[PDB]
Design a binder for these strands. Structure first.
Lengths: 281, 279
RNA sequence: GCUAAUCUACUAUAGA
RNA sequence: GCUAAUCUACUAUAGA
């Protein structure tokens, strides 16, 4: 019943431009003004935990434009991806092959790809990867709060203290996040304990085969006057396996969903973009 | 009245020699034959979980001799470190040294350092690092079993499956290991659950600041076959915003700074260096 | 640039 | 070569 649309955009600037932080802001404007698919306003303004919307950074060459600082200054073939779920017909809108104008300047947007999938059909994919090593690549700065794997019982005890991010991703944190997102996506509540136990159990019984990670500092804007805001997250890749069949299946399932909506905080602004890959033994 | 001896050795080979795997075996020999501190023999032969003994690999320069993915010359300054605890009268034997002869060949052993600390005086040090970022450097391949942070309830459920090592050091996993080793050091049982909770909680309330880690594969011999395993090396810098947790953690960590971390410290794995940063 | 990981009388979340 | 990281309607294990 619920399903995900992942649309691949081609964005070209006409003049030379300095992109804001984060770079996804441009497209947000197109939504926040009802220039591109307005039926997302609520979703883009939403403050609900683990909301099912992902608006990626633009990416030049085979990379997503890193921030922390400066400019592109050149009309070129930029890339974008937007992923989401909701009962509102997106197929009615989309289109748009001409140019648009923002407070950030003039852009020409196109569509390169359309992918639509129903979340229950991805369970079909899972079975063909039950003998693969799972490699998760963080193609954008990924922010994983540690408290996510805190026992729900002590939630109020440490409710005030902000422990910050685990810039070193455990398997359990990744699958716990994937689970939370999946869960909010398919409209299942009171799930804290299932999430907690899933994460703990998963990284207690996971085998980490290889990895190449690096901590990065991400800038996320100013707001309001006169501040300036910025976090620490992770980038790179990680390859692991879960010898338990049931655990592996659940994990693969949730992970496939995150392969569209992203992982960790705060996917709503382009963070936590991931690519899923596999290897045979 | 528990305490730790850490002795720093200077090892020179006399002939051209090929080191065994692991290289710590050389020093291990001096104990299993009563050439060095014989009162440790049983400890080297012991199979007790988290025994308080660490006998490091040999090392040329600041680095520890990595293994067959060779041979050292007639004269070469190798280094060694051994740390331990026990109530068995060793107090004398420590000093011991000279030119000993082993099945790996003939060596000249010296002493370039001797440190003794009692675990009770360490907590004072704790108090001055209560505002520091804690940096743990793995100067040798460190093996961290993931099941350490498995809920003790399901211990029997998965007693057979061997999940292997987490080559990705969790803050909670390393402090859990530190806790277990410390606990065994001071003679405490029923720790499984306290350890579990400690690790889970610390991993939930930790902030990881920076790191440079890389997975490595180490070989440990054959006997029949060929033995090998996967661990981690590099460094990791973190902080724990909770006072009680940070206190406990630093405490256990100081001990692991002598006895090593994870398994199996008895043969040179999990050698760590503890460092700090002021904020 | 390198990226699967192992033997044992299960103390095996151990010891080598 | 480089390794601290935060603003808010505490939905804050969130959203930007």
């Amino acid at each position: 019943m619920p399903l995900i649309f992942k649309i691949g955009y081609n964005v070209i600037p006409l003049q030379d431009v300095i992109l804001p932080t984060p770079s996804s802001k441009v497209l947000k404007y197109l939504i926040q003004s009802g220039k591109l698919i307005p039926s997302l306003k609520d979703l883009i303004t939403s403050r609900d935990k683990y909301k099912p919307i992902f608006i990626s950074h633009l990416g030049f060459n085979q990379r997503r434009i890193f921030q922390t600082n400066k400019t592109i200054t050149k009309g070129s073939r930029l890339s974008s991806i937007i992923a989401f779920s909701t009962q509102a017909n997106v197929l009615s809108e989309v289109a748009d092959e001409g140019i648009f104008e923002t407070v950030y300047g003039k852009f020409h947007i196109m569509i390169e790809s359309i992918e639509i999938v129903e979340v229950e059909k991805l369970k079909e994919e899972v079975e063909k990867h039950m003998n693969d090593n799972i490699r998760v690549r963080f193609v954008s700065p990924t922010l994983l709060s540690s408290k996510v794997l805190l026992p729900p019982s002590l939630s109020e005890r440490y409710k005030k203290i902000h422990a910050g991010y685990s810039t070193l991703p455990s398997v359990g944190l990744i699958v716990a996040y994937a689970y939370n997102v999946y869960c909010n996506l398919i409209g299942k509540k009171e799930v804290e304990v299932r999430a907690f136990k899933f994460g703990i159990l998963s990284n207690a019984l996971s085998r980490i085969i290889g990895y190449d990670l690096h901590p990065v500092t991400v800038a996320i804007g100013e707001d309001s006057k006169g501040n300036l805001r910025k976090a620490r997250g992770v980038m790179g890749w990680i390859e692991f396996d879960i010898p338990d069949e049931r655990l592996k299946r659940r994990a693969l399932n949730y992970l496939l969903t995150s392969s569209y909506l992203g992982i960790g905080r705060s996917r709503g602004i382009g963070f936590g973009e991931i690519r899923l890959e596999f290897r045979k033994i």
